[PDB]
Amino acid sequence: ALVNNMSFVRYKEVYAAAAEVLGLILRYVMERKNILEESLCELVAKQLKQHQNTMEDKFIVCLNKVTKSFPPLADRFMNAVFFLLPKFHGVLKTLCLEVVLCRVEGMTELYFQLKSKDFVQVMRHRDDERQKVCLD
Amino acid sequence: FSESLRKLCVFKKIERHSIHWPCRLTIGSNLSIRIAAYKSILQERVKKTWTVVDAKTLKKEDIQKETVYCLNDDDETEVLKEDIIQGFRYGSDIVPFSKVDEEQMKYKSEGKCFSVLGFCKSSQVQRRFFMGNQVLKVFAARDDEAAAVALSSLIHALDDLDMVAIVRYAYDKRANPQVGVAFPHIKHNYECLVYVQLPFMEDLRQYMFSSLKNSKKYAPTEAQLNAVDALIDSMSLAKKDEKTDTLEDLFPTTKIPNPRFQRLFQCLLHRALHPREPLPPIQQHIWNMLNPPAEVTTKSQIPLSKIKTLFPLIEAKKKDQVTAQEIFQ
Amino acid sequence: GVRCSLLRLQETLSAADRCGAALAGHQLIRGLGQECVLSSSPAVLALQTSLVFSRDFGLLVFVRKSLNSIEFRECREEILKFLCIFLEKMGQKIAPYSVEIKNTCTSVYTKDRAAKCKIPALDLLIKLLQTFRSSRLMDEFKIGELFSKFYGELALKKKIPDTVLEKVYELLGLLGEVHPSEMINNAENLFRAFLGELKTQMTSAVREPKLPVLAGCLKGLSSLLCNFTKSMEEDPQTSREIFNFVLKAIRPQIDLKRYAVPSAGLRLFALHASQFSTCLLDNYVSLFEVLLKWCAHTNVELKKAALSALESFLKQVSNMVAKNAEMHKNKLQYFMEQFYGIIRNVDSNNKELSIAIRGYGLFAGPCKVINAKDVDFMYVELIQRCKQMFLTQTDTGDDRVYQMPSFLQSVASVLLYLDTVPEVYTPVLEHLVVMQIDSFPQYSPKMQLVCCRAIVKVFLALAAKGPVLRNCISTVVHQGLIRICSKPVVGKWKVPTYKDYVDLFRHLLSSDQMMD
Amino acid sequence: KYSGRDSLIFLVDASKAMFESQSEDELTPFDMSIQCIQSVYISKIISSDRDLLAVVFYGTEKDKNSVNFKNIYVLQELDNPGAKRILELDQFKGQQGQKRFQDMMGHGSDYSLSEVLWVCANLFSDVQFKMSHKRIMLFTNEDNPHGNDSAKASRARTKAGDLRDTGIFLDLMHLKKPGGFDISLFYRDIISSKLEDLLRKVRAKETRKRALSRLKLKLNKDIVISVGIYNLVQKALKPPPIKLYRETNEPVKTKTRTFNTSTGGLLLPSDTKRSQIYGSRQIILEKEETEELKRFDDPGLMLMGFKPLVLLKKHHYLRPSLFVYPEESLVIGSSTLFSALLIKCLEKEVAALCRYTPRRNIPPYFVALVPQEEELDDQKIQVTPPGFQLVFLPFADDKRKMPFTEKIMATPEQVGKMKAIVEKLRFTYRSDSFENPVLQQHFRNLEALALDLMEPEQAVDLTLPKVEAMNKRLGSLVDEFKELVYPPDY
DNA sequence: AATGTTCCAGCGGAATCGGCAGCGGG
DNA sequence: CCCGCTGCCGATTCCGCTGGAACATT
């Protein structure tokens, strides 16, 4: 019931807030490690999957919120994040870049991945918020 | 004076037998029956066009509409009709070679025909695939009516069976060839062969619809089922009466005339007689003509209320179509 | 910054991979425009103005050369948008390039197909025609052929988006407003056009009205009515139809959001009420009701224009009744009843108190026609009421200095009409004028215009009586200087030193002519 | 989604084994793949000319792609089909095209099968459109692109699943190395020959799905169920011509207007009226008046009652039937009433009767909502959906009366021989496949004109009768019919 | 003249998207 | 009075269907 309302995509203060709280909870259960962490991680990945291919914008909003406090969830979804990156414009592309920033370390190549997604041009886009994330 | 207004009975034996279209049934290439197709049930339109006349002089010849094809230059650099060839969208581009080329290489129908393509036994021709704008009826040719008896034999062989005929029909050389069905029929005053068009393969469309039988969100309650049963029974428009043990036809919509041209006639009459008065109202006999008799409505209110109070919330209504005349008064 | 991106924006036009080059071009345009807008230094600012409007590279060249290419539509949009901003940051210092820009707009409108590009072009052309109102350039803007083109657009084109019919109609009106000498021979047709389209959009019994077309047609009619008066004096056919349409557009219909038709209709009213006058006395009850209820609508822009419309309505009806205030005494009685009912009503709406008392003072004129004594009853009722509230009432324990300008205007309006000033309220009137001079800083801006107008109207009022009262001007000015010079100079209020009064006198002794 | 254009990337194998024809002179499989892609372009350029198509070559020598992997050549980034691209692929037909391919990019190399999948993913991910299906057709015959490496195989499987999760479905048609499907590849893991259809199945068709009307079926006072009125069968017709400028082949931007009240001057749509001259006198009224005299009801369906399906006789056809199907999003709970009515009407064999009004200002017209039952099986034969069929009912003058003054029967023995003939010619009508000769010929002529190849094909008219076939399959009984009672008699 | 075809014009579904209001904070 | 988001709702674009008017033929 906790993760369900993250599928109630009509008010940000509902699904986005649920995603924030979910990230906090899941980081907590990871830190104070207990056998509820993988179950919740997979459960949350389930609704994220259900959003990934039908509502990309809400998918990335929720994924950004969760990875604000729980980076390691992004590993399952960085492939989808990269596939979606060329199709976003505005704040959503910034959210995608923050998501990929969360897990920059440990990514095997990340440079073919970025140049392929035309990283140099997106860096010259006129926006102080996104430029900063690109430089990070 | 009730039904005479309600029906076209006031017109009788005034309209002539419309037109015979002469052709020949060809089964294979040897059998041939001289046939006359009479056009039959067919959409009716008014035969007069509203003519654009300029105001304050009411003269048609006083105005001429032009149509120039200029260009997309910085100014509208007009070109002439002699400098124009029709193209066709093909992918992302436009194909020239307008009219004489396609006149040469267009399909040629090889003249009119009513050849038979075979026969279909069962309901492979079901009414939801009729596709025409008209319905023909072919009878016969007179003057040594060997054709008429031959077609009588054909009709009886088709209707004693459930068999139907698939036909390649073409009006003339220029008409696009069509393929259709040929109904047997059951009439005693006469015996025809009724033809309707039939779809090509790029006409019909496959659309996927979620089922309602295997639906859990919309499973109907048996109380709802019997409420709907009561409504249907209370709202029937057919009956068995007059001690004939046969079903009659109440409210025969196939008999009343089109209100469109009737109301147009009355509006034209009123505006001709009274040029200053505004639009008349719709005659009350018109509305009474287009409504079921009172007994079914009176029988129906109660089951209607049962369904209204018994079926789930008919909830969402947030739409409107307000008109300028009523939004500014 | 610029001409680094401008050259790149030029070279993106010839580069392959269009719609991929278009994104880079759009980003170049956005960054370039953002750099240009933010720079405030006339040297760099002029350099940017020259570079943007260059002839080899430059925004207009890009627009004209990227015009047979759909891929750049967004870019074109952006550029036109930016220019509407740049023309606003600038002024007549776009004048050298104006014709250039004008041509560009026209060309875009006739070659681009997206309404999202036609709209910015028409907006820029409207703002050009508005920036260079009276200038040498207007004869160079080929206004006659511009009108010929856009008036052809009304017939020789079928079904435009209506987000561009709005702009086309508004521009056709603005052509009549500015440089009317070249519109002289073709305004009549234009009038018919408006009276045509408006009619449909407001009288169709078959189709939902197009609100944007309504707003545009009303705005264009408003502009056209300047320089091309349609008065009931000589046109009691067209003017009545104009009034009927305005009335329909402002009256309370079914509760409508998207306040754009009432707004334009009653702006037209506020600007040209005098033009259609006889109709204005035939609907005074309903007009007054509608205008009042609009004034309370709480919409920040509808309320303003509604108040202006009410002011013009009251002014016109007062003038009309004053000429013949014998068979219109019913209307005098009605309006006095309404103003008194407002005053007697315990509301916190200072706006309606202000309009009530100001209309009371306005109608004081025609009231003396029927009695010649109620004008003397006024300026005593009014002076006493105004002394009891701005002269002794809670010296600082309230906030009702808001309606002092309206009271003082009312007094000025009243006393212009009475002879034989009661000569014992002269000191109190002087004290009110002195105190409003003293309380000028206490007002917000755009509320300082009204009080300066009130002060100057009072000064004009009692300067037309006789030298005996012209001495009161000397005394009141002397007292105002006494007060403002006697101030210290190095849930909270502020303190004025002397600065806040400067514009005050700068308005009083120099800037009344365009105001009085 | 409605505006979701379909995508398809063609991934063909050029390594070594498709430039030799397995010791045959029939067709090299590379040529077979090029033929297939030509077929798909020419089909979707008139069937689905909004879908995106791409051709990518792997195993080549030189490379081209946004990542610069080796041996991957994207011939065409995915976009709408056109004549230019069909010609660009046509230059690789046959052995002459084979050597042309050899010289422009050159086959033979060590491809990865994990860089190429990545290139396909990038292609899919670099477009700015809503895509309904991402699919990749792999044209290859080899079984083990990993014949000497297992890390390569693991990376390929990884990237295949990595494609699959993003909704990219890889399907493989294998160009039969010996000419017959006995090479059974074990890659059921990677994928989700059936190819003759892909050579030529759909000569011409279209794609869509849309409401065509969103109305309210009102139970005559307040019980309103929202409902869509779909068009199951439509009578498609050839696209309209485009006026094109001779000297440059450009659209010409027509503009029509009316003017010259004997003076010369544009007439606005407000200074004209509409008249009809009857007999001697002329009746005049304005445009909104001539639009409003045809106005009876608001758009929607209103029940007039119920009639059993028996007494509406099924030769009263004048307008192709439509398809009522419940729409809940406008008013909630409509589907429940719709299902109840469907079930009850089916069990009673009674069709509803309504007064139909599709648009705002249009005369009402009587229709019959005939229930139809969804049919389906284990094979999932979804060939009719549940709902209602709007049969349009004629009024009184849409009917026409005929001579009818002819009544002559035939003896009950010609019926037997006609029965012989008809049961001889009895055949199952069809599921499809009577495509319009005029439309198909137009498409073929247009293909020829755009690709200016040789000269236009001749569409084989399925509509024509196989006259000799009937003549031979009847034999000696039609003449027996001709002269049994009625000789010519001269 | 009867009709079928072509052409032009108008309405609506669906997706997109921008800004218009109104609603809290400063 | 400002200032700022943020729902959301209106209009555009793109299709597609229908209707009406014009065409050309025996």
Author numbering:
A (entry chain A): 2302 to 2437
B (entry chain C): 227 to 555
C (entry chain A): 7 to 496, 517 to 542
D (entry chain B): 31 to 222, 237 to 534
Excerpt from the publication:
DNA-dependent protein kinase (DNA-PK), a multicomponent complex including the DNA-PK catalytic subunit and Ku70/80 heterodimer together with DNA, is central to human DNA damage response and repair. The DNA-PK of vertebrate cells is central to the DNA damage response and the nonhomologous end-joining (NHEJ) pathway for the repair of DNA double-strand breaks, the most dangerous form of DNA damage, which may lead to genomic instability, carcinogenesis and cell death. Later, it was discovered that the effective recruitment and activation of DNA-PKcs by DNA requires the heterodimer Ku70/80, which is formed by two subunits of molecular weights approximately 70 kDa and 80 kDa6,7. Using the latest-generation DNA-PK selective inhibitor M3814 to mimic ATP binding, while at the same time slowing down and inhibiting kinase catalysis, we succeeded in obtaining two different conformations of the DNA-PK–ligand complex from one cryo-EM dataset: the intermediate state, where the inhibitor binds to the ATP pocket before the closure of the kinase domain, and the active state, where the kinase domain is closed up and the ligand is brought next to the substrate-binding site.
